[PDB]
Design an enzyme around this catalytic site. Structure first.
Site, PDB file in Angstrom:
ATOM      1  N   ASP A  27       0.886  -1.186  -0.082  1.00 58.46           N
ATOM      2  CA  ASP A  27      -0.132  -0.016  -0.088  1.00 58.46           C
ATOM      3  C   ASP A  27       0.914   1.302  -0.033  1.00 58.46           C
ATOM      4  OD1 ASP A  27      -2.429   1.565   0.038  1.00 58.46           O
ATOM      5  OD2 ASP A  27      -2.724   1.367   2.134  1.00 58.46           O
ATOM      6  N   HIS A  40      -9.590  -2.121  -8.632  1.00 58.45           N
ATOM      7  CA  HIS A  40      -9.608  -0.804  -7.728  1.00 58.45           C
ATOM      8  C   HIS A  40      -8.920   0.330  -8.043  1.00 58.45           C
ATOM      9  CE1 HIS A  40      -9.947   0.904  -3.722  1.00 58.45           C
ATOM     10  NE2 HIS A  40      -8.587   0.793  -3.659  1.00 58.45           N
TER      11      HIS A  40
HETATM   12  C1  HEM Z   1     -10.233  -1.609   3.123  1.00 57.93           C
HETATM   13  C2  HEM Z   1     -10.543  -1.124   1.870  1.00 57.93           C
HETATM   14  C3  HEM Z   1      -9.315  -0.970   0.715  1.00 57.93           C
HETATM   15  C4  HEM Z   1      -8.448  -1.719   0.242  1.00 57.93           C
HETATM   16  C5  HEM Z   1      -8.267  -3.119   0.880  1.00 57.93           C
HETATM   17  C6  HEM Z   1      -7.468  -0.924  -0.532  1.00 57.93           C
HETATM   18  C7  HEM Z   1      -6.444  -1.583  -1.195  1.00 57.93           C
HETATM   19  C8  HEM Z   1      -5.516  -0.800  -2.044  1.00 57.93           C
HETATM   20  C9  HEM Z   1      -4.505  -1.322  -2.617  1.00 57.93           C
HETATM   21  C10 HEM Z   1      -3.818  -2.518  -2.237  1.00 57.93           C
HETATM   22  C11 HEM Z   1      -4.111  -0.059  -3.376  1.00 57.93           C
HETATM   23  C12 HEM Z   1      -2.935   0.018  -4.362  1.00 57.93           C
HETATM   24  C13 HEM Z   1      -1.618   0.635  -3.251  1.00 57.93           C
HETATM   25  C14 HEM Z   1      -1.220   2.085  -3.871  1.00 57.93           C
HETATM   26  O1  HEM Z   1      -1.317   1.985  -5.196  1.00 57.93           O
HETATM   27  O2  HEM Z   1      -0.916   2.689  -3.152  1.00 57.93           O
HETATM   28  C15 HEM Z   1      -4.914   0.933  -3.283  1.00 57.93           C
HETATM   29  C16 HEM Z   1      -4.879   2.069  -3.922  1.00 57.93           C
HETATM   30  C17 HEM Z   1      -5.753   3.149  -3.729  1.00 57.93           C
HETATM   31  N1  HEM Z   1      -7.155   3.050  -2.977  1.00 57.93           N
HETATM   32 FE1  HEM Z   1      -7.526   1.791  -2.044  1.00 57.93          FE
HETATM   33  N2  HEM Z   1      -8.307   0.178  -0.727  1.00 57.93           N
HETATM   34  C18 HEM Z   1      -9.361   0.541   0.295  1.00 57.93           C
HETATM   35  C19 HEM Z   1     -10.075   1.348   0.330  1.00 57.93           C
HETATM   36  C20 HEM Z   1     -10.288   2.671  -0.479  1.00 57.93           C
HETATM   37  C21 HEM Z   1     -11.150   3.674  -0.716  1.00 57.93           C
HETATM   38  C22 HEM Z   1     -12.511   3.652   0.253  1.00 57.93           C
HETATM   39  C23 HEM Z   1     -10.910   4.575  -1.425  1.00 57.93           C
HETATM   40  C24 HEM Z   1     -11.527   5.767  -1.935  1.00 57.93           C
HETATM   41  C25 HEM Z   1     -12.872   5.770  -1.947  1.00 57.93           C
HETATM   42  C26 HEM Z   1      -9.558   4.052  -2.013  1.00 57.93           C
HETATM   43  C27 HEM Z   1      -8.926   5.059  -2.913  1.00 57.93           C
HETATM   44  C28 HEM Z   1      -7.625   4.361  -3.438  1.00 57.93           C
HETATM   45  C29 HEM Z   1      -6.901   5.080  -4.120  1.00 57.93           C
HETATM   46  C30 HEM Z   1      -6.849   6.212  -4.751  1.00 57.93           C
HETATM   47  C31 HEM Z   1      -5.558   4.247  -4.542  1.00 57.93           C
HETATM   48  C32 HEM Z   1      -4.662   4.727  -5.412  1.00 57.93           C
HETATM   49  C33 HEM Z   1      -4.754   4.413  -6.905  1.00 57.93           C
HETATM   50  C34 HEM Z   1      -3.766   5.175  -7.817  1.00 57.93           C
HETATM   51  O3  HEM Z   1      -3.494   6.262  -7.531  1.00 57.93           O
HETATM   52  O4  HEM Z   1      -3.522   4.771  -9.071  1.00 57.93           O
HETATM   53  N3  HEM Z   1      -9.266   2.730  -1.488  1.00 57.93           N
HETATM   54  N4  HEM Z   1      -6.062   0.520  -2.592  1.00 57.93           N
END
Ligand code: HEM
Ligand code: HEM
Ligand SMILES: *[C@@H]1O[C@H](CO)[C@@H](O[C@@H]2O[C@H](CO)[C@@H](O[C@@H]3O[C@H](CO)[C@@H](O)[C@H](O)[C@@H]3O)[C@H](O)[C@H]2NC(C)=O)[C@H](O)[C@H]1NC(C)=O
Ligand SMILES: *[C@@H]1O[C@H](CO)[C@@H](O[C@@H]2O[C@H](CO)[C@@H](O)[C@H](O)[C@H]2NC(C)=O)[C@H](O)[C@H]1NC(C)=O
Ligand SMILES: *[C@@H]1O[C@H](CO)[C@@H](O)[C@H](O)[C@H]1NC(C)=O
Ligand SMILES: *[C@@H]1O[C@H](CO)[C@@H](O)[C@H](O)[C@H]1NC(C)=O
Ligand SMILES: *[C@@H]1O[C@H](CO)[C@@H](O)[C@H](O)[C@H]1NC(C)=O
Ligand SMILES: *[C@H]1O[C@H](CO)[C@@H](O)[C@H](O)[C@H]1NC(C)=O
Ligand SMILES: [K+]
Ligand SMILES: [K+]
Lengths: 446, 446
Positions: B166, B302
């Protein structure tokens, strides 16, 4: 031939860890509970042998003990031979002149079927083990209450919350311990049910167990401190040192652990740190009168109240062996945060801190309960003193909430009394039986 | 430009510690609370400057933020220019197709006045700091709720509970962050209220703050793992390998952090760890049709749902700069114990674990709220795809407790749907404002 392989570690050696958790549970599903008790708990219960070797010390050390109602829930209706255990600590509270009204509400009854003691060097590990236990047992148990405890920080390690070195004095089990100078020496059967000279008949499966008296005892540290300052015996030099002296005379040791019987007017830290010396006294001194002299140690000092040594007879020179049967093993650990700046500056407690009190004994009426009611709470104990009224134990002595009248504390007039507010507040607890390890995957899971 | 001495550290750089506590409070006595806010809290609030220097890391890092009702309790009636913040997150729950029935009761309302974020490398240090705070504020503050969070142990450090690395992807603030390859670049006003190109009028004292969207999101790890095994596409690879592929296609990265867009069939742990390569993609590929090709990365993954990049037009070659205004700074940290053997064996969660989700933004409506409702929860986002139904974000997409329809996840057939139970369960949260530090002993204490 104490079978130490079969005796749970905390009883005889302590858990030897930085952190502990006391996890008080109910049993909801006996049949399911028994399966996991035998399959999952039994094999990881740490014994005296295991804990006595730093090599066999587990990441998380685990002991478990059951209340009377816990045993009934497992269909264990045998008489363990202890009526205080059987009736529970709540029904016993009036003996100690407190009301269950100040107790942790879950202590104020017999809903608690048992306690699991977890010990480890980090709270992280403890929490992972809780998770593991809860998911193993699932719905077969409910947590009713828990209390976290730890060895205090840095220089204060092994000191309790008022700042006094603790764990100095235990009974030496004849044939198990190497007696230190001054240490009482007792039959195994005083602490271990069914052990040598335990006169009470036990179920065979209970042989090698012990009764756990648990107490959550809050300490008002800032208030204590300020009281010492306010009532420091006149003299010199500094006010703090005379406050310290008075503190010492209340406990019977300096905070360094130096016994005041051996060093009555000034601390001696090296003495305090020396296991070969710091317990080597009886309260007798040539040539003072034992019945009248409080210049070495007040008759009302905590330790002299809880182990009276020559006050109850026996050798005047070390070691005194009086009142063997009234010995307890203590595995108490401090709980709560350190005193904060705000609390210290205002001389007022805001955060609950104190002692998670744990005493082991084969007969509750001889140990914790006897010490509390018949000695500590007894204004006329010990007997045969002049003046006759000793007053209550200034640390633990209780009188239905009333400030405690305590005599002998002031070095220059042993008739001079003090009225001392409670600095320790009981939030109650419970009586458990710590079964031998074979009973855990044996009788109790049957 | 950006005065980083005045910006609370967590907003821009995170707390850089192993442990965090989220301490949710109410203000009982504003006059007294203010006093201590100014004298006691303001001085120790950790700025971006302090946290960016390895040698000025505080022993305990502290940030603080207030709810709408918290600001009101402080006699601050000014318009912060955010209607979602004003309403609180309970009233927003409908927008995300989730019932408040699963919410921490304390979140389901507006009784919570703010949150203190404590960060340290041990929980001991946090505990002592909590005590210090509570003794200083006395009865003027009250703890309503708290969540303990921690970096995961050993080689899972920096990974969230599902096991994925993450914190790889964040907006680069123009003038503040030197952009990495592929990283979006945004005006500071997207994150910092009143900073460059923030179109919304703010009170003067609020310039340099941010809106903190907190969410307690439970993760069902065993269930997730089982779902992957049971639904892994048939193939010549091992079962574990095909399960992992499905997982990675749900997230848009392999667990190592490797973006599947750049490595669609294999993990590449060397890539995952390299900040220079691991974000350097747009979703575009010669010569594949951006509108229909899901062989590199499903439209529903995601990270692709939450930063659409080339899906919203702009440069096909990195860096893509689409949708800058919909950027969030992420300071989320896992909470709860590690998966236990019982849960793993059973494929069933019994111990609550997940993500203590923290997003920072200058407009709630453009950040978290927007990403959840308009993008993640929308079966037709991103737009212009064939087939048109992308389905929901498999990670966070919500459909009123119903299984989510998610398309594109199976490499062999982009039209093939899976009906997916929630793996994440919202226990709700709240919208806070993290003020500039100057405001804390300034306006908020006045
Ligand atoms: C417990 C629930 C969640 C899990 C397990 C999760 C998991 C992840 C993972 C594994 C990544 C990739 C790591 C990274 O690129 O830094 C990520 C990126 C991200 N997540 Fe989540 N996430 C969760 C909830 C959320 C929520 C609620 C949002 C917003 C509504 C969110 C927004 C993002 C964003 C914006 C990124 C970066 C994507 C990018 O810049 O390309 N996440 N998440
Ligand atoms: C929070 C309350 C208590 C405090 C602060 C306290 C403090 C102490 C201290 C400082 C010592 C001396 C250190 C040592 O010998 O290891 C001690 C010893 C002792 N305490 Fe306590 N104590 C408390 C409660 C109790 C209770 C409830 C009992 C039993 C009724 C008890 C029984 C003993 C005994 C038996 C000793 C050892 C006496 C000896 O071997 O000479 N204490 N206590
Ligand atoms: C525990 O305390 C007792 C005192 O109650 C110590 O016993 C005493 O030990 C000393 C050794 O330093 C003995 O002194 C010797 O006395 C003989 C004559 O009795 C004399 O000829 C020597 O020059 C020497 O001074 C003393 O007799 C003895 N008293 C008793 C009653 O045993 C004991 O040493 C202490 N233990 C430890 C480990 O400190
Ligand atoms: C980021 O990825 C891009 C490709 O999307 C890389 O750009 C290519 O780099 C190679 C090697 O120099 C060139 O042969 C191509 O012509 C480049 N393509 C374009 C469109 O510029 C870029 O090198 C990558 N950056 C890093 C740090 O790896
Ligand atoms: C607390 O008590 C000590 C001694 O009695 C004194 O020095 C100090 O000023 C007191 N503090 C307050 C707030 O009364
Ligand atoms: C000792 O204190 C008592 C008070 O209880 C008092 O009666 C007596 O005068 C004191 N003794 C001396 C020698 O001052
Ligand atoms: C857990 O799920 C796996 C994969 O579906 C299966 O092999 C296993 O039998 C399940 N365990 C139990 C206890 O049902
Ligand atoms: C897969 O795509 C959809 C899934 O519903 C289906 O209609 C189509 O027949 C499938 N194609 C293949 C090759 O399986
Ligand atoms: K008894
Ligand atoms: K908004």
């Amino acid at each position: 031939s104490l079978n130490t392989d079969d005796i749970q570690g905390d009883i005889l050696v302590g858990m030897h860890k930085q952190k502990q958790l006391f996890y008080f549970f109910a049993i909801n599903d006996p049949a399911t509970f028994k399966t996991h008790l035998a399959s999952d708990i039994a094999p990881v219960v740490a014994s005296v042998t295991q804990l006595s070797n730093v090599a066999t010390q587990p990441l998380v050390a685990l002991n478990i003990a059951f209340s009377n109602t816990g045993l009934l829930a497992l269909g264990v209706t045998d008489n363990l031979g202890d009526s205080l255990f059987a009736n529970g600590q709540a029904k016993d509270a009036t003996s100690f002149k407190e009301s269950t009204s100040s107790w942790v509400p879950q202590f104020a009854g017999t809903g608690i079927h048992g306690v699991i003691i977890l010990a480890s060097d980090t709270t992280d590990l403890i929490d992972q083990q809780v998770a593991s236990i809860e998911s193993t047992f699932g719905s077969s148990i409910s947590k009713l209450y828990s209390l976290s405890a730890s060895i205090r920080p840095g220089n204060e390690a092994g000191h309790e919350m008022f700042g006094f070195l603790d764990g100095i004095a235990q009974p030496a089990i004849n044939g198990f311990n190497t007696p230190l100078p001054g240490q009482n020496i007792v039959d195994a059967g005083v602490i271990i049910t069914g052990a040598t000279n335990d006169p009470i008949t036990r179920p065979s499966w209970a042989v090698g167990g012990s009764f756990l008296a648990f107490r959550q005892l809050e300490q008002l540290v800032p208030e204590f401190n300020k009281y010492l300052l306010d009532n420091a015996p006149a003299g010199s030099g500094s006010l703090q040192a005379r406050a310290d002296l008075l503190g010492a005379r209340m406990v019977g040791r300096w905070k360094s652990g130096a016994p005041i019987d051996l060093t009555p007017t000034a601390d001696d830290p090296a003495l305090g740190a020396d296991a070969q010396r710091n317990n080597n006294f009886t309260y007798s001194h040539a040539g003072f009168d034992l019945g009248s002299d409080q210049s070495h140690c007040p008759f009302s000092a905590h330790i002299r109240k809880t182990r009276p040594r020559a006050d109850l007879g026996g050798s005047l020179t070390p070691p005194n062996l009086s009142a063997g049967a009234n010995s307890i093993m203590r595995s108490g650990i401090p709980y709560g945060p350190e005193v904060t700046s705000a609390e210290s500056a205002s001389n007022t407690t805001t955060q609950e801190r104190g002692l998670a009190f744990v005493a082991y004994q084969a007969q509750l009426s001889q140990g914790f309960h006897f010490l509390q009611q018949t000695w500590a709470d007894n204004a006329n104990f010990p007997p045969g003193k002049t003046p006759a009224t000793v007053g209550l134990d200034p640390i633990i002595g209780q009188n239905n909430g009333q400030p405690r009248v305590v005599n002998g504390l002031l070095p220059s007039n042993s008739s001079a009394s003090l009225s001392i507010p409670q600095f320790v507040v009981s939030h109650g607890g419970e009586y458990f039986f710590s079964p031998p390890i074979s009973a855990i995957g044996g009788r109790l899971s049957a």
